[PDB]
Amino acid sequence: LQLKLELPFDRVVTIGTVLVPILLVTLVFTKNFAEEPIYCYTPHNFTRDQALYARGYCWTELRDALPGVDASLWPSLFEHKFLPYALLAFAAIMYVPALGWEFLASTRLTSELNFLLQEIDNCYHRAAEGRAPKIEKQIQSKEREKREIIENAEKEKSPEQNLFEKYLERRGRSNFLAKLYLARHVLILLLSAVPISYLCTYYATQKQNEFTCALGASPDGAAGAGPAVRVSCKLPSVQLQRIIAGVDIVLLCVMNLIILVNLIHLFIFRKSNFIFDKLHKVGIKTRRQWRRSQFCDINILAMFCNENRDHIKSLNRLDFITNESDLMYDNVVRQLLAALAQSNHD
Amino acid sequence: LQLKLELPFDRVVTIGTVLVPILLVTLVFTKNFAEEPIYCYTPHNFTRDQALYARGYCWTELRDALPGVDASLWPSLFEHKFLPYALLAFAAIMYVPALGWEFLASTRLTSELNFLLQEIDNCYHRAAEGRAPKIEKQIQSKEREKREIIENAEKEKSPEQNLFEKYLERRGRSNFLAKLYLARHVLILLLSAVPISYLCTYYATQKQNEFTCALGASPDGAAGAGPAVRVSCKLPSVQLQRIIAGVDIVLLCVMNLIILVNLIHLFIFRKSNFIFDKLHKVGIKTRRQWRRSQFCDINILAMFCNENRDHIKSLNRLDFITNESDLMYDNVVRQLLAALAQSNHD
Amino acid sequence: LQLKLELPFDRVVTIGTVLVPILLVTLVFTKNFAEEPIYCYTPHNFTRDQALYARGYCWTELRDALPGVDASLWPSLFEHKFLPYALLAFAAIMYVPALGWEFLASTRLTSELNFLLQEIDNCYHRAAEGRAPKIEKQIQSKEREKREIIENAEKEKSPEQNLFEKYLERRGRSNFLAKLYLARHVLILLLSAVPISYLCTYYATQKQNEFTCALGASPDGAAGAGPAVRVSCKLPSVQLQRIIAGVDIVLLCVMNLIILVNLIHLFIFRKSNFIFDKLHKVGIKTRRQWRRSQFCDINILAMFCNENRDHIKSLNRLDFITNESDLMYDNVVRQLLAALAQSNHD
Amino acid sequence: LQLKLELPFDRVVTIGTVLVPILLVTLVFTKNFAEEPIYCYTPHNFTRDQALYARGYCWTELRDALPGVDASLWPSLFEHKFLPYALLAFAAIMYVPALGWEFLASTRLTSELNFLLQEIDNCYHRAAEGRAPKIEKQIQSKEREKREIIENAEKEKSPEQNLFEKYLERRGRSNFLAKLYLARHVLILLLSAVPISYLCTYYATQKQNEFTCALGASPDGAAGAGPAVRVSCKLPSVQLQRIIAGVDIVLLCVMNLIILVNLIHLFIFRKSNFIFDKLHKVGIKTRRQWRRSQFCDINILAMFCNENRDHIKSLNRLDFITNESDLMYDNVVRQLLAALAQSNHD
Amino acid sequence: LQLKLELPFDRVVTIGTVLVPILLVTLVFTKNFAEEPIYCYTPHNFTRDQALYARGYCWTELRDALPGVDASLWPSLFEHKFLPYALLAFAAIMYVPALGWEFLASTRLTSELNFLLQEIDNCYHRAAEGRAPKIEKQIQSKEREKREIIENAEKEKSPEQNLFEKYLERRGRSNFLAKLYLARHVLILLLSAVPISYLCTYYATQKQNEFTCALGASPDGAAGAGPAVRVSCKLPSVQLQRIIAGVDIVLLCVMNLIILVNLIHLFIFRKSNFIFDKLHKVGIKTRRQWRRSQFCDINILAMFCNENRDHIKSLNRLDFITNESDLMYDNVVRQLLAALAQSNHD
Ligand SMILES: *[C@@H]1O[C@H](CO)[C@@H](O)[C@H](O)[C@H]1NC(C)=O
């Protein structure tokens, strides 16, 4: 079968950052192509062909005039016509970082997690093996419990246990994957900084519906220049665009806040991770020699393991048999169950 | 199952070189067919049928006139009508080289990599076999370490190790696949040279929206010639085409730069490859007898293997157990683990 | 699984001969149906229904008139209307020969190659068997090498090797499949000879965009004949058709040249084939008794096997272990490897 | 898996007889619906609604008038409107016989060929068994060869060989399947006789493109009858229909000729079939007791087996090992190979 | 896999009774929607909106008028508008009985045929077993043959032979399934009786294309009633509907004739059925105790068995090894083959 590399945070982010804006984009496209581009109040003299020319020129030129001349460069309205493509551009731009992280991390994370799942499976098999002599030691004794636990900790270190210790020690000082994850999310934030600014500058000031274009050719001059006509036009699609702009602004701002909160929780406020607590459940040191640097590789690997917690069978059951992450502090029940489950079968 | 032959770099290149321009092409087609081809300001007399004839003729002829006669050959505008097809032609042309390389390298690379993966699997199985006597030699000894490593290197040459040496020696002087890869990427660059030039010539000079056509027939002469009418027309689709042209120019220029940078890094600045370092991890000579020519077949086979790194199981684990590519310079732990993992099982 | 019979060159030919023209045909259809069939400058008096009748009649009749009567038969323009169907006809005609060859060779080539792949597999298994006693012979000896090779050639002839020799001898004088392949490619060339001629005769002379039709009925005579009106019409789709005609002409001419070059290389300039050299690698006579007639069945079976080179596992490896097609001229390493690989396993 | 019953000649016939006419029919439909039904030169007085009524009535009535009254029954043109449905009817009618033969022969031919393939497999297994003692007999002898072959023919008759003889004798006088095949192909020819005649009558009689209809009601009489107006109409789709009619005529005539030639070759000129020659290859009588009647069931079963030649494995190889259909006339090599292949394995 | 129950004759019937009329109905829909509903010769005064109102009213009312008043109920034409739905209704009604039979017989036929196929398989295995001692008896003897056959017939009764006898005896008097099949076919005929009559009534008398409707409202009265205008209208779709009606009539009448002939052949003229002759082949009584009532269950089960002939392997071969349905009357070959094929294998 296949192993998962997603994580609910990342998929929620990509959904709310790309899928929703794509839906709004297609909705705007449908609304705009269902209606007519522009509505121009052509004079009475205009024939139907001339009126069509006016309604086409005023939608291609799309530049508002002023009562008097008042300028040679008068305000334009091109953004009302260009937005429903800029939204697609923003959707693609904000979808790029997920693809980049996928390309840059697929093989590496696949290999690392493939090794880690087997390593944890063997670690919990070793835990099953090592809990067996504890009951015999306790009966031999029959603080007692404290000294028994201390001597067990001293004398239990297995070869694969040293393998785990060395692996954790080397990973703790190899922040490559944490670097990549932080880079991906910071890149998402920085890219989102662009459309937020653009839309806020578009929702804020450039919200105009009606203008008055000026047609230039004006035939019928009869060897003369001819009268330059001014035609008042109104755009029908500005309202939905101006509403979708605000919707997208709010959505992307909320996504930015969510990303920042998650990063702060993971790299500053977080103290205990998944794998560390899971190992401590069976009983290990978890000393600071591989800690005190929250910007650590295992720190994020914990999240992937938690998502893939059920990709490995054994661990699963061992987690739900007990609680409190003190599996080795009971005298009889929790360890006696494993004793009768495994020791006799051999 | 299937084995991959696509490098992330090549897939990124083909995406950004073909898929994006195809998307822009279909967007331009949608915009052009949603709108109306041309908008002509027909005179007042023109009936609807005559106006339709004018709006069709001026879009078929598509040749701008001048105030006076001033010529018999006056500037044309055929490109504004022809571009959204030349863009498809460029997309297909730039997709050609990938298909050519596929057709010319499928079987050869398939066979070569099928042989290489099995060879490396057997090589690492041999490494597992050969690490076992090293611990026994060390205990027999109990600079010591340096002389032990030297004698091990001298006396460890295995039959399949000689197979590997001969294979590498013969591949180092057979640059066929490197020739083909350089040819493919240089061909992509050369093909990109064409549309870049064309679009830059189109975005640069031939960018105008409004012209004035001259209708020729002019019936209603009543046994006479008739009046040759001049009709001012405006194209609605020039703006989007002129923007997509710039977008494509920038995209393809960036792709060209990426191609050149990758080639320079791979064939000039690169010093160490994947397979060489991987073999040196277990310990081999890696002498210059099969090196000093970066334009080498194994140089790219390294990249193909790296993409297919996880297609071979054993190697994977052996990479993450240790680091520093000095697996055999550790006295106990690294080789003691393998000794207990393999020697006792026999 | 399935076995291939595509031989890249044929697939390239059929692509460039059928698939591309089909794409151009559908592009022309899209352009023609997106536009209007004809644009006619109807007089002022014409109502909308009469103008529609004129624009329909002048596109159904589609025969250009002349200033005066000047004839009862005046030049026509039916090809501008008929081409985008003749192009489909040419595509189908050029696709026919591939289907014919498939129908006529499927079963026979399937059977022949199914026999040949197993036959070569057994041959290389025999080669593995026969290299084993050679090393013992050399050690017994310990020109020596030349006499050893000669005696080995004399005394090594195996039963299945006589099967090989008889099969090759009988195939060398049975040119049925070579006949069929030459017939297929010559038929493709001959069928291409038609569309090239037609399109060149169309791109060359029958190229004009505007004509003047003459409407016949002319009601409103009020018990009289009525005025025969002349209406100037312009076709919008001639330009794209005239460009696609040239594109197809160039493409099919290049395909013809490629076919001719490939045939000349294969049947005249070619001297060594795949199977012959592959057998000589292990060492056989390859005498002219089954050669000197390049128009030979085994000649194209060699290409078919080369395409299917990896459909037989063993051979593959045996090709990449050595080079120079002198596998049995090395004293030790090449045959010592096989000796340790096979002799001990028995 | 599945067994084939397609006999490529039949598939070619059905292709060129049904699929091509269906393609032409859909092409005609596309052309007719893309265009306008009829083009009528309505007078000036007509409004747009009256002009639409005229253009609809003259295409529903579709009956040409004459200058004077000249009749009450004047020539009609209904076939120009009805053909693109008669073509569909002809396509379905000519597809019927294939479906009829399928329904009437599926089970019977399935069972017969399922029995025959196993019978021939067993027959060639017996051939392998029986060639073994021939070498021993020859060595015992060591005309000699002729007497050995004669005595082998006399004494070799095996049980399943008598089974084969009885089966062939009973099939030779049971012409049911040959009857059915001849009936199918003669029925295809007879059904083709209809559309050939109809189209040749249509491609030769109906060539009118233009007529002059007479509208009947003519309101505005103001308590009077009103003027019966005559409107000249032109059909746009007659040209393509008239061309497709000729194309279909030629195609179906060529198919008829191909069918007749194939039947004449199979049932009159044919002398040797597949199964008879294949059995004679190993050596049997093939006497006229089951021959002299070319209209025989086994005659077409031979073609069916030839199409299914590779559906049985053993036979395949046994065909390519030798040639000349004289397998048992070779002294050593051909039979010695089989001896070493089979006799020792037991 | 799946077992077949379609009885291809019933597939032919359902095809020709439902699938063809559905094709004709969709063709009529395509014709009617490609054209316009009605063509009305509106007077000159009518504007375009009033003309549209007239062309819609006269097609909604669809009731022909008369020159004088002549009635308050004048002939209608609703059928010309209602037929292309009545055809769909008839198609569904005709498809109903097949669905009913399937729903009512699926499980029962599944169980019955599942039993019977294995039952016949066991019967033919028993026949293979029982032919073996016959050769021994014949050699013991060495009318002789007649006495041997009669003593075999008396002494060969096996337990499963009595199972066969009892099953046949009990089925012969259980005519439920024959009842169901006859009911299905007679119901198909009776349901066909409706559309045949309706269409023959529609094709016969209700055939007129042109009528003259009378518009009622007639505004512009200026405080007065207004002039009741009469508008001549013509339907364009009557011709194709009238042709399709005749086509359907002929098709369904021919289907009725086929059904009647098949039923008469099956239940009156039929004498020997598949299973009876198949069992008589190996030799059984087939006495009239389970016969003389052609309206019998096994009578129809024979057809399903014949369709499912090849669904049981053994039977197949045993049918074609011999002929004449006298397998046991041959002395040596037919029985010696089975003897040497089975007796030695035990
Ligand atoms: C209108 O038509 C007359 C002749 O028909 C021509 O002289 C005049 O220039 C036309 N006016 C315009 C504005 O084209």
Ligand SMILES: *[C@@H]1O[C@H](CO)[C@@H](O)[C@H](O)[C@H]1NC(C)=O
């Ligand atoms: C105008 O109409 C009259 C008759 O109605 C015709 O003789 C004349 O040719 C028409 N003029 C043109 C320019 O077609």
Ligand SMILES: *[C@@H]1O[C@H](CO)[C@@H](O)[C@H](O)[C@H]1NC(C)=O
């Ligand atoms: C013109 O209209 C009148 C009635 O308005 C009609 O009688 C006459 O036939 C029409 N012209 C022709 C050529 O039919």
Ligand SMILES: *[C@@H]1O[C@H](CO)[C@@H](O)[C@H](O)[C@H]1NC(C)=O
């Ligand atoms: C045309 O209109 C006038 C009044 O508007 C009316 O009297 C006359 O009957 C109308 N024509 C017909 C054919 O009814």
Ligand SMILES: *[C@@H]1O[C@H](CO)[C@@H](O)[C@H](O)[C@H]1NC(C)=O
């Ligand atoms: C025509 O217009 C007048 C006023 O302009 C109005 O009173 C009258 O009702 C109109 N005609 C009809 C038929 O309504």
